Design a protein around this motif. Structure first.
Motif: not given
Ligand SMILES: Nc1ncnc2c1ncn2[C@@H]1O[C@H](COP(=O)(O)O)[C@@H](O)[C@H]1O
Length: 147
Positions: A90, A94, A98, A102, A113-115, A117, A135, A139
């Protein structure tokens, strides 16, 4: 001591979707390869290759890209097997992406899912990778130590 894995989970089938215009296909590939490697050596079973190569998409098409890629990847699997993980790259800022991501994964697709940056994709440090592996492990049903 840093946190470590107690029980490593299993990611046999995964895909990546990229939403950052600063990230070319090959960089998404390389990032995911390094992450897959970290997950593995930390104690997970983790397929070094994805079901399908990374695809790049506009945030405006989050719904269509996720649903289509989910369908196409799942259809490639042995009957009854499912996608274990979606890795999403991402943009650093964004907006609603996000949360849209989700909501779709949690309540429509039912996929973990794992986001990640863009800033971390360019850096790709071992410490970051180790944290993201931790993480992911939780999950998918693994267990980590506590401090
Ligand atoms: N709106 C958002 N809220 C929370 N985390 C975000 C957001 N946009 C990008 N991220 C990134 O999402 C990452 C973790 O993603 P995830 O574990 O999939 O929830 C963190 O390192 C954040 O910096």
């Amino acid at each position: 001591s840093n946190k470590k894995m107690i029980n490593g989970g299993t990611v046999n089938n995964w895909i990546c979707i990229n939403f950052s215009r600063q990230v070319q296909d090959n960089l998404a590939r390389t990032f995911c390869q390094e992450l897959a490697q970290m997950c593995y050596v930390s104690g997970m079973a983790f397929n070094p290759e994805p079901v399908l190569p990374p695809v790049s998409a506009r945030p405006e098409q989050v719904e269509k890209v996720l649903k289509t890629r989910y369908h196409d990847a799942t259809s490639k699997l042995s009957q009854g097997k499912e996608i274990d993980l979606l890795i999403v790259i991402l943009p650093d800022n964004n907006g609603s992406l996000y949360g849209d991501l989700k909501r779709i994964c949690e309540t429509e697709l039912g996929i973990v899912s794992q986001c990640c940056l863009t800033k971390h994709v360019f850096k790709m440090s071992k410490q970051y990778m180790a944290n993201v592996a931790l993480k992911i492990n939780v999950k998918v049903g693994g267990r980590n130590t506590v401090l």
